[PDB]
Design a protein around this motif. Sequence first.
Motif, short mmCIF file in Angstrom:
data_model
loop_
_atom_site.label_atom_id
_atom_site.label_comp_id
_atom_site.label_asym_id
_atom_site.label_seq_id
_atom_site.Cartn_x
_atom_site.Cartn_y
_atom_site.Cartn_z
N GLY A 283 41.52 38.41 48.36
CA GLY A 283 42.04 39.84 47.88
C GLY A 283 43.47 40.06 47.90
O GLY A 283 44.03 41.18 47.63
N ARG A 285 47.25 40.45 46.60
CA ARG A 285 47.57 41.18 45.35
C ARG A 285 48.75 40.20 44.65
O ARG A 285 49.54 39.51 45.38
CB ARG A 285 48.01 42.47 45.40
N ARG A 289 46.21 36.93 41.06
CA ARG A 289 45.18 37.69 41.15
C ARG A 289 45.11 38.29 39.60
O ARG A 289 44.12 38.25 39.06
CB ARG A 289 45.33 38.94 41.88
N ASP A 290 46.28 39.10 39.06
CA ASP A 290 46.25 39.87 37.96
C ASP A 290 45.67 38.62 36.58
O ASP A 290 44.80 39.00 35.98
CB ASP A 290 47.68 40.35 37.43
N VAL A 293 42.04 37.90 36.97
CA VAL A 293 41.15 39.39 36.56
C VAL A 293 41.24 39.30 34.91
O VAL A 293 40.02 39.60 34.52
CB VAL A 293 41.79 40.40 37.53
N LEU A 320 37.40 44.24 33.29
CA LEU A 320 38.55 44.35 34.19
C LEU A 320 37.96 45.15 35.65
O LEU A 320 38.25 44.48 36.59
CB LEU A 320 39.84 45.14 33.95
N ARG A 321 37.12 45.98 35.52
CA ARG A 321 36.64 46.72 36.64
C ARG A 321 35.72 45.66 37.38
O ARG A 321 35.93 45.78 38.58
CB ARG A 321 36.01 48.05 36.35
N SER A 324 37.63 42.92 39.15
CA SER A 324 38.32 43.38 40.27
C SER A 324 37.16 43.71 41.61
O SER A 324 37.71 43.29 42.61
CB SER A 324 39.00 44.85 40.02
N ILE A 327 36.18 40.63 43.36
CA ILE A 327 36.98 40.22 44.30
C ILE A 327 36.86 41.21 45.57
O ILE A 327 36.80 40.77 46.89
CB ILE A 327 38.38 40.19 43.75
N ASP A 328 37.11 42.42 45.21
CA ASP A 328 37.48 43.32 46.47
C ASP A 328 36.10 43.79 47.20
O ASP A 328 36.33 44.01 48.59
CB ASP A 328 38.11 44.63 45.88
#
Lengths: 347, 344
Positions: A283, A285, A289-290, A293, A320-321, A324, A327-328
């Motif tokens: 997780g 940032r 990560r960007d 994603v 993208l959601r 994300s 990962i989260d």
Amino acid sequence: PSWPQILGRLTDNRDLARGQAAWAMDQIMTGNARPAQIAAFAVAMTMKAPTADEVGELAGVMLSHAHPLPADTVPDDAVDVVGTGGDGVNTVNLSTMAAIVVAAAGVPVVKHGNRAASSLSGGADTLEALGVRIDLGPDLVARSLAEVGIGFCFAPRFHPSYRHAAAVRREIGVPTVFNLLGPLTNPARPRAGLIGCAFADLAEVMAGVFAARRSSVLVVHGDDGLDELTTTTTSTIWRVAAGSVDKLTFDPAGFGFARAQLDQLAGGDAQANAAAVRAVLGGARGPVRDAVVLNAAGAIVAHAGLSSRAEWLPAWEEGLRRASAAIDTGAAEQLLARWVRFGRQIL
Amino acid sequence: PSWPQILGRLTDNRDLARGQAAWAMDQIMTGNARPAQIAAFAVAMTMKAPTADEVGELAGVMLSHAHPLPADTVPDDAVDVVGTGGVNTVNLSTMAAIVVAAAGVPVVKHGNRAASSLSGGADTLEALGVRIDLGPDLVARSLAEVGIGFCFAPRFHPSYRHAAAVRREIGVPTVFNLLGPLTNPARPRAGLIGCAFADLAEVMAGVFAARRSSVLVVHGDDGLDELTTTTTSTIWRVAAGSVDKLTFDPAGFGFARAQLDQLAGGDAQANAAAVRAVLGGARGPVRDAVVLNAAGAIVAHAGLSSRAEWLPAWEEGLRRASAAIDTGAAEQLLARWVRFGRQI
């Protein structure tokens, strides 16, 4: 057909007659082509600029010599996430991390590749550094796909007849038309993917081959010699679905991403890259990560394209959601652990 | 310098930096280039389009590895007569070389046996009974006693064997095809040198210009690597470090227009019969082309010492070439060359 005829046509800057590229590839694959003939062919094809028809012939013959996966073991909707190689640019195996994230988002993934020749760790090298078993037979790749949702086809194992071309590619060093083939000869034959290419003109030819196969693929060119999507730059994307192709500009700033610097994405040795994978999956940032994603989202948009054609922007927002959340929620980290567990179960 | 750096530059369509073509050629000549590297280099250099400086580095490195002829055995005014190939005109250049030597100009040729049915330079000479594989000392005696000599490529360029194998394997013409006339181990300073492509003829003239040379680089405007009789030709006249490019029309010397199928060479045996016929005085388009090209070699030769101008040089070259045939001098010199090889 003969080498003089085929090499002659190419050196005159002419496209080949139908079937000539196939004959050349079959000579290479059967061990009948001398190393000098292989090299002359690869270079001449590169400098002429291969067409989609020519590349489809090379790839189709190479595929015919490859070991298949067992019948019915590859999900109908499996995807690849892969690039044809950066242009003097070496990122931290973003496509390897995006693959994990995509599979964690519920999309089956089958990658295909080799160990790197140098101490700049390739995706496969980084996967082994994480504890993944990368060199498995067809039966076991199919079981990994079933039980884990991701598999990896080790190229030397699935393309043994390619060894003659592989030797020659190492000797000459420079990128050639053969650099395009990896994404078009995945032995699992996924019908969708996110495929990167460091050159606009070649990206377009690859999109033409995927169109001809009626794949649902996004072929991406980073406007800066990257063969993947990045927050470093805007990108060009060919959206391929239903034999047809839209060429689109893609600016990640449009989705709220900050501009990053290329050096923030740089790869290192296998141990370093393994640490970067663990950080992103835990997780962390930042621009790594960007980019993960972004690439995972593009693969998810391509996957969606197998079954409908949604509006571009909402397809991406949803991609993208999903990337994300994978990962989260911890799903991507847990998927890597399940992948490692699977490999350890083999003994 | 490395293969990826040089091959990458070429595939990017860029001219090489000074020294890079030399490094590549030296790797090739020393047995250090892998066959795939040699082939990649040959092809990439060809598709980029070689410059005169690049070709000069290739030829100069190749010459550095060649066997020379013995000190003071090549007359300072020796000439070569040869084309880089198409089809080919080994028929024409063989006959013109003999005519030129029979006119009293020292001629030194350079070549190989071909693999194909299409004759190499050496093959036609062999079919005529000329002994082609002689060492430097006997080539020098041939030049002094007969007025003509032949440097067998495998004997004078042993280190080229790696490149030659690759060339045979790929078959396609490359920049390597341009190097024959530029790597004559006797280093003649004059020549009539044919090329089948106008852009590469100009590059070759640029290389000769950087030498102390008097050469006509010639390109038939029908694609012939020789002065043609079918139509006009382009000549790059090279002397004193400069190039004078011109359109040449042998109609101005009363040559009738021929058809292209009439001038091309065949196998060694077909060539040898054409040689016997022409040197015996058979008239027709083949004779005419032989005389045209021999005269061009005579003009290049005259450029070494003579202040004679272009047109009168041609008129005299034409008279000398025709007379070498018609007085039987050419026939006699070939006989003499055959005797010399037998008498070794």
